[PDB]
C-alpha cells in the first residue's frame, strides 16, 4: 500500500477545508466526510495506481505559528492555496507560506492552488475588491507565482462548482509519487 502525506496550507477562509471536503466526497464508495482532516485517509487512483492520501488541514491553525509546524514532518506533497477573490491571500504565498513550507518541508513538491475560481467572474466580489482598489487574481499571476516559488505546478479550482478539484489531487499525487 502506497501512502502519501498531504498537508494543505494558506490564509484563513481561502477555501482549504472545502477543497478537502469536495475531494473526499468524490470518493467511491461514498463515505461520510467529517469536518476535520488530520491524517484523514482518502483512497485515490491515478494512472492505474491505488494511492492512500493522508490529508492534513491547517485550517484553524493559520495563527498558531509554533503549533502549526508540528504537522510538517514527513510530508510528501503540499497544497499551498490562495483565493482567486483575494489578492491578499496570493501575496502571502511568497511572504508567509513558501518560506515556512520550504523550511519545514525541504524538497517536498508544492502544488500552487488558486481556489474559488468561480468568484473571478462574480460581480459582487468585483465590487467589494474595488473598494480596496483590488481585483480578482488573473490566471497569469498564479502561473507566475508558481514559477517564482518553484512549485511543481499551478492549478485553479472551485470547491463550489467542483471544477478542477479532481485535477488538483491527481497532480498532487503524481508529485508525491515522483
**Could you list the residues that contact ligand GDP (CB under 6 A)?**
12-18, 59, 115-116, 118-119, 158-160
Contact present, 99 and 24 (Cβ < 8 Å): no
CB of 36 to ligand GDP, least distance (A): 11
- Total residue count of the chain as it appears in this document: 178
Query: Which lies closer to ligand GDP via its Cβ, residue 51 or residue 79?
Result: 79
CB of 1 to ligand GDP, least distance (A): 28
Q: What DSSP designation does 137 have? A: P
CB of 41 to ligand GDP, least distance (A): 19
Query: Which lies closer to ligand GDP via its Cβ, residue 4 or residue 116?
Result: 116
CB of 22 to ligand GDP, least distance (A): 8
Query: Which lies closer to ligand GDP via its Cβ, residue 34 or residue 150?
Result: 34
Here the cell at position 143 is: 502561473
Query: Which lies closer to ligand GDP via its Cβ, residue 51 or residue 118?
Result: 118
Question: Which residue's CB atom is positioned nearest to ligand GDP?
Answer: 59
Query: Which lies closer to ligand GDP via its Cβ, residue 51 or residue 84?
Result: 84
Contact present, 9 and 61 (Cβ < 8 Å): no
Query: Which lies closer to ligand GDP via its Cβ, residue 116 or residue 174?
Result: 116
Cα(68)–Cα(19) distance, integer angstroms: 19
Cα(163)–Cα(107) distance, integer angstroms: 29
CB of 158 to ligand GDP, least distance (A): 4
Of 110, 107, 54, nearest to 82 by C-alpha is: 110
CB of 19 to ligand GDP, least distance (A): 6
In a 13 Å sphere around the CA of 98, the CA atoms on its Cβ side amount to 19
- What burial letters (b/e) apply to 82-118, b meaning 16+ CB within 10 Å? bbbbbbebbebbeebbbeebeebbeebbbbbbbbbbb
Amino acid at each position: 500500500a502506497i501512502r502519501k502525506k498531504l498537508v494543505i496550507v494558506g490564509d484563513v477562509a481561502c477555501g482549504k477545508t472545502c477543497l478537502l471536503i469536495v475531494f473526499s466526497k468524490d470518493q467511491f464508495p461514498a463515505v461520510y466526510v467529517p469536518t476535520v482532516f488530520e491524517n484523514y485517509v482518502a483512497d485515490i487512483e491515478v494512472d492505474g495506481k491505488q494511492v492512500e492520501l493522508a490529508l492534513w488541514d491547517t485550517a484553524g491553525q493559520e495563527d498558531y505559528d509554533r503549533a502549526r509546524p508540528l504537522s510538517y514532518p514527513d510530508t510528501d506533497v503540499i497544497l499551498m492555496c490562495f483565493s482567486i477573490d483575494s489578492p491578499d491571500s496570493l501575496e502571502n504565498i511568497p511572504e508567509k507560506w513558501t518560506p515556512e513550507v520550504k523550511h519545514f518541508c525541504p524538497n517536498v513538491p508544492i502544488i500552487l492552488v488558486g481556489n474559488k475560481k468561480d468568484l473571478r467572474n462574480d460581480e459582487h466580489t468585483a465590487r467589494e475588491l474595488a473598494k480596496m482598489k483590488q481585483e480578482p487574481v488573473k490566471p497569469a499571476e498564479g502561473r507566475d507565482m508558481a514559477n517564482r516559488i518553484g512549485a511543481f505546478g499551478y492549478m485553479e479550482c472551485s470547491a463550489k462548482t467542483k471544477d478542477g478539484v479532481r485535477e488538483v489531487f491527481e497532480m498532487a499525487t503524481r508529485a508525491a509519487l515522483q
